[PDB]
Each structure stands twice: as structure tokens, then as C-alpha cells.
Symmetry: C3
Subunit: 317 residues, 3 copies
């Protein structure tokens, strides 16, 4: 179908984070059989292979932003690849990685479909600017490089000179926020970004949360959706092997429901599975659980419904 | 009362499953004190004792259906016993076992009350026909022998010659579906069976799910209810010692709420607690947790409310 | 602000319980940095220090009520201290302890604000009278000494001669009830106490539960709220190190939502964090989890929202 016509892009990149290890995100997400599982449902999966990220040996912090040139060039490469897989009419399934790659994954996707609406599922806002950041990491600042409303509040970071901010403030919906810094929250409330923090999810139920999300994005006009999932968005009992797990988050069922409701719109046009960190699993079972949850989320984005799926044939024969 | 007038039927039967072990379901559910706990609330529990299932030594598969004569005769015996305990005006609490016994547990119950409405709480549809099945087990095909709409799609399986399909397609409500085969889902969607998969539960909330279930069954006309519970319907964190646990299912609170809302209708007229498998608990604590959850579900079906219960006496004396 | 102007009162008291150990509740809740964490948000925390409870050496049971003089005098001392911290215009954050101290914590708070409305978050009703009790503990009977409707049903217990019942039956709302004795439930239903047992929470969603709670208390007239939290109210997976954990209770998110909705009314005027028992943690991780959950609940009562908090300054500078 026009949906579930996947183009998979590896992104074994971790330099946008503190001392990392998420670069073996694609390796585990694939060795857990993601392509082999996406082919049972009628998906035209094309593996564009793990991106070769050229090395930046001498790459010094900008002011506090750790290793900005590496992240900037990695995201430019990813954006080029994502534009390549979107010109083929596919769904750019960028499985990474860290959100420092979301800058590329959305900037490339917006080169083709300028009017995409982003659904950001993350425990964090990931909206620090290079000025208001505190840890000086770039996994925590991918949205600030994308919002049109933050132009002028984003310094000319080295390596991010190619970034033209693409999404408006009114084209992004946060789901699952439960760990927001004061600067992130000031930016979030000033720009009028629609967000469904954990409190709004508890108040409304995930069903009403997703109904409002889709009526807010796809209400005025049907547009592509770029679900930029982050596995720390789900509760740590389900995804323990992630960078910064925050307790009391979306359950497994709620994550699956988010993805199923996004799929059923049929407008999904890009997906990111970020922050799978198999090095932070206390036990190999924790890594297996995180990877299985990420795989289940990914599959549900592409038609695998919990009620069960059947091919359009007469099974009573 | 006319409700909570229980007639307990053991069903230590496991041959409807792959290599089994659920036959010690009644043993553990009783040794965990089910009768002794059902007598504190005003319940007229009568133990009809574990059914003696005669042995079928030479019992070969039909086409792929494993050991069909054993299951067919065991379910005929159970149906006879259930009709016996329903002619006494009781509530046939058939604690088993596996759903291969649901054929008997509902066919016998329908001999007395022809218009029962079945509420099937299972992670699975359990609706394969002997033709559309893949594992060739009978624990996965009890509904297909009961639906009137599948007559002609059910081969003359040996040992199930007594089965007259009793429930319509519009008298069964699935709750908790999260693992449905393509054939099961085709049957489910073609017959128009009302089902509340895990997605509908997440969308609506268990409160609205049970309200719609009871308004669908008991809306047109008050009828007996046959809650055919399956402990894999609850999340594996609560019932790990079951046959085929599927992650991301009904929580403990949701299962208790289902049973409490069924009880408060006062129309419960049959209950099955199936698929308790104390041999698949990794640790004895897992078996204890599964059995305690099954016991709590069973008790809540018979008046034990979470808000607390009091006898109709003046406690301030 | 007028809210989050905390006055912290220790209450290292455990004699209202069976063989205890909750007296090191304040010690752990503080050593886990409660004051140091309440000062980041704009809170004017004043530590009134752990109460010195004078010893009662010869203190014999009344009829079945264990050690009544100790509890009565401890609660009188606590009520005096709470009136002291409420005359300073603060929020009496009494972190204990056991609910045997709720008699003092609410009687003192009602000396100042006679019209407070109590929101009782506990798995238990804690409403036994010294006559209808079965264990003869006083941690299970603090509400019965407070309700005006139980005058005459409360014997002249030694040490509780100072207790004038202060709250009506229509000024208390239970949230999270899932373990109620027959006598407690008779009292609960006779007095017409508004309660949201676990069943009502499952039916309504915690959002609707808190909306009804606040529309019931603060609907007719704005009044102070005395959230008397009890960590056994949350599910044992989140607070295992408590006195009598009851499985299938409020989740972490639901507890945080209760506290956030109470705070956002801005009428919170007293808070109790009771029944933290670091001696019943099977492992030190269990104690750490219980204490972290209690601390998170406490913080959320005083402005720490999950969406994130920012000081009223321009963070984009
Ligand atoms: Mn994140
Ligand atoms: Mn099942
Ligand atoms: Mn309690």
C-alpha cells in the first residue's frame, strides 16, 4: 500500500549524547528481526542500510554544546538520505541513534513534504537551545533547531549551518512529557506548543489524548505525520535500556495505542525509533525487553493491530 | 442469594493443549483455598468435585487437531455435569483446565439456559476452526464449535459429534484480545462478533468497555451471562504461570473491574477460570501470583467488591 | 507564594500500629532530601523538626485497642504543633509516622481552619471505632475519632479525652479504597461518606475521579484541603515498604495526578505522608523506591508538575 511502504535507514550515531552507546541501536533493532518482521504484513520494506558517518577527529565543543560538528554533519547526512527515501514515496523509518539525529530526520523529511506535522513521543521536551541548555548535549536540543519560532535564539553552532528550521510551533505535539527543565518549559509555554504531558494523559486517557492530537494536527488539513518516537517515552519497566529513563511514563499499551492510531490515519510519513541503548541494560533481559518493545512499537506503526490482521483472502477455504 | 449460589466443578483436564500441565489447575486453585474463601461472603458453595475423566489410550489426531477424542469426551462429560449443576439453580464455576473445556462448559450451560450471553476474557480469540487452525490444538478452537454461524465450516471431528452449536455470533463479547491469528481475525470480522481488543480497552477505559459490553448483551433483554475467563487475558506481570502469556494485557484492576461489573448485574450464571498452569511458573512465587490473581478474580465474580462488603447487620453494636 | 509555604513537622511515631518500625519515616524521608528538594521550587520551607514524643512506660490496652495513651498523647502533641504551624500561615506537612497521627494532624489543623475538607488517600478506610475494630490497633482507627457523626459510638478511650471530632461525614473523600473490613464498610455506607474505591477509579479514570472529588469538596464553597496521604494507597509495586500493602492500587501516575490536581486548586492547607516503613522493605531497593515515591508525591503537592516548572524569568536570555 502507499502506507507501510517502508524505507529503513540505519543511523548508528551516538555523539549527540553524553558518553554514549546508543550507536548500536540499529544493530540490535535489526538483529532482533525488524525487517524480517515487517515483511509478514504487506510492507514493501527497502533497507537503505546503516548510514556511513564519516569521522570528525578534531571536534571541540562550541560553548557548552559537546561535539557539535559531528552531530551537525551526521544529521545533514541523515537528512539527505531521508529526502532520498521520501522521493521514492516511502516512509523514512530512521531507526537510531539518538534525538540528535531528529534534526536530520525531520529536516530531510521536510525538504520533500514541507507541511509535515511532528508527533514527538518523548519523556523529555528535547527543546533546549544551545544557550539555555545545561548539560550541553545535543540529544536534548533537536527541536530547537527545527522550530521557526526560535530563529535568533539559536546561535550559529558549527556544523548546523545547513539547518533551516522547518516546523512551526503549531505543527508539533508532545506526548508523554514528564521530565522538563525550566528552560524547556519556558520555551514550551511561550511558543504555545501543544503538549500532552503525563498529567494530561492521566486526565484524558490515551484514547482522548490521541483523538485530540490527531484532531489538532490533521484537523485543519490532512498532512504527513512524522512520529518521532523515543523509547524513554515509555515507562522504564518496558524500556529500561535507554539513556535517561524517567519513571511513571507511558505504558506498553499506551505506546501501542499511540502508534496504532497514528497508523490508522494512513498519513504516517516518517518514523524515528531513537535512544535504544543496549549498553545500559543491567541484565541482557532488560536489553531484550527494550528492543522487543521498540520493535513492537515500530510494527504497530505499520499496520500490526492488536485485534489481529488478515490478508484480503477467504480464510474459510 | 440467587446469585453467589455456586456449584464448583473441577476439570483437571489439559489434553486440549500442547504438552500440558494445566490439569493441576483445580488442585492449586483449591489448595489456595477457593472454597474456604468463597464461604465468608454469603455463598452457598457446593463442591461437585473434580470430574473423573476416563482415559482414551489410543486417540490419534484427526487431520492436524491433536487428540480430539479425549477433548470431545471430556467436554461432553463437563457439559453433562454443568447441566446438572444448573438444574440445581446454581452458578457453574468450572475451574480448569483449558479452554478446550469451554465447549463443554458452555454447551452444558446452554442446555438449561438457551439464551446465555458469553463474555470471553482471553488474550486470544480461541476461534480457529479445525480447518483454519495452525497448531492443531483444541485449546485454541473452543468458540468455533459453539457459534451457530460456523456450521458447515466445522468438520465432523471425532468425539465432537454431540456438539450442537449453541451461541450466536451476536451473543459473545471478547475482552482483552491482543494475540489474534489471521484466520481468527477473518472469522472475527466476518461474523460481526463484538470484540473489545486491547486497543478498544485503551481507547475507552475499562469502565466504558464494560458499560458497552453489558449494554450490548443485557441491553435488548436480560439474559444469563457466562463469563469464560482466561488467565492469559490479564497481563503476564499478574498471571505469568499460564500457557501462552501475551505481554501488554489487562491489568489486575481491570480484571477485577470486569468481574465486579459482571457480578453487579446479578445475572452471572456460569464462570470458567481456565489456563492456570502451575508448571510454567519460572519460580514458585510466579505460580503463587497467578493462582492468587485467579482466586481474586473468582471471588470478585461473587460479590467480593473492592469497596468492601458487610453483612446486613448493625455493626455499630 | 501563599501556597507552597511549607512548615515541615516530623512525627517519628509508630505506636499506633502493630509491632512497628515506621517511626523512622521522617528520618528516611528527610535523608532522601525532602527539604533540599522542596527548596528548588519557590517554597518557603521551615523545618519545625521531629516532634519529641515523651515516653509512656506503663500504658496498657483499653479493651482491645493497643497502647492508647501513647497514641493519644502523641496526637495531642502533634495537633498542638500543627496549630502552631498553621497560625504562621504555613502548610503543615506532617511526615510520619502512621495514621494514628492523623487524629492529631487533622484536629490541630481544624483548630485553625474549622471548615477544612479532608482528602484521604489510603487503601484502607481507617475508620474502625475502638468497638468495631478487630486488630485493636489505632493506625486503623483515626477517622472514627474525627467524624462528628460517630459521637457516642466512640468510647472514652484513655488519652483521647482531648479529641473533639472536627470533620463532618460530608467533608471527607476517600480515594483508593481496596481493603475495607465489614465494620468499616458499614460505617462508610451509613454515614454517606463520599468514597472513590478502586472500582470507582477504574470506572471513571483518575481524571474524572479528581474532578468529582474537588467539585464535591470545593464545589459549594472554597475551603482548605487536608490531603492525608497514605503510601499504601499506591500500588505495592511503587510503595512496597509500607505496613499493609494491598495489591492492585493507585499507580504512580495516578498518585502524582491526585497531588497535582490538589495543588492546582491552590487550597492545599495540610499534608500527611504516613506509613513509610523502611523496615518492611525486602531489599534496600524497595525502601529506596518507597521513599522516592513518597518524596515525589510530596513534591508534586507543592507545585512540581510533570509538564515542568520554570521561574518567572526570561529563559531565552
Ligand atoms: Mn527522550
Ligand atoms: Mn486464552
Ligand atoms: Mn492506609
Amino acid at each position: 500500500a502507499k502506507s507501510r511502504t517502508i524505507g529503513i535507514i540505519g543511523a548508528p550515531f551516538s555523539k549527540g549524547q553524553p558518553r554514549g552507546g546508543v550507536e548500536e541501536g540499529p544493530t540490535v533493532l535489526r538483529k532482533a528481526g525488524l525487517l524480517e518482521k515487517l515483511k509478514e504484513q504487506e510492507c514493501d520494506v527497502k533497507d537503505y542500510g546503516d548510514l556511513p558517518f564519516a569521522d570528525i577527529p578534531n571536534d571541540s565543543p562550541f560553548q557548552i554544546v559537546k561535539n557539535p560538528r559531528s552531530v551537525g554533519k551526521a544529521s545533514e547526512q541523515l537528512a539527505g538520505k531521508v529526502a532520498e527515501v521520501k522521493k521514492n514515496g516511502r516512509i523514512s523509518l530512521v531507526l537510531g541513534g539518538d534525538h540528535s539525529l531528529a534534526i536530520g530526520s525531520i529536516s530531510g523529511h521536510a525538504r520533500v513534504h514541507p507541511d509535515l506535522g511532528v508527533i514527538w513521543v518523548d519523556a523529555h521536551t528535547d527543546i533546549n537551545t544551545p544557550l539555555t541548555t545545561t548539560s550541553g548535549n545535543l540529544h536534548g536540543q533537536p527541536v530547537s533547531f527545527l522550530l521557526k519560532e526560535l530563529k535568533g535564539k539559536i546561535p550559529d553552532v558549527p556544523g548546523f549551518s545547513w539547518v533551516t528550521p522547518c516546523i512551526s510551533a503549531k505543527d508539533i505535539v508532545y506526548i508523554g512529557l514528564r521530565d522538563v527543565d525550566p528552560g524547556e518549559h519556558y520555551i514550551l509555554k511561550t511558543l504555545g506548543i501543544k503538549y500532552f504531558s503525563m498529567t494530561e494523559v492521566d486526565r484524558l486517557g490515551i484514547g482522548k489524548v490521541m483523538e485530540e492530537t490527531l484532531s489538532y494536527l490533521l484537523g485543519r488539513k490532512k498532512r504527513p505525520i512524522h512520529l518521532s518516537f523515543d523509547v524513554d517515552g515509555l515507562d522504564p519497566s518496558f524500556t529500561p535500556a535507554t539513556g535517561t529513563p524517567v519513571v511513571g511514563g507511558l505504558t506498553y499499551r499506551e505506546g501501542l495505542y499511540i502508534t496504532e492510531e497514528i497508523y490508522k490515519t494512513g498519513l504516517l510519513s516518517g518514523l524515528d525509533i531513537m535512544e535504544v541503548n543496549p549498553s545500559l541494560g543491567k541484565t541482557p533481559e532488560e536489553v531484550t525487553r527494550t528492543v522487543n518493545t521498540a520493535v513492537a512499537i515500530t510494527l504497530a506503526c505499520f499496520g500490526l493491530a492488536r485485534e489481529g490482521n488478515h490478508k484480503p483472502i477467504d480464510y474459510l477455504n
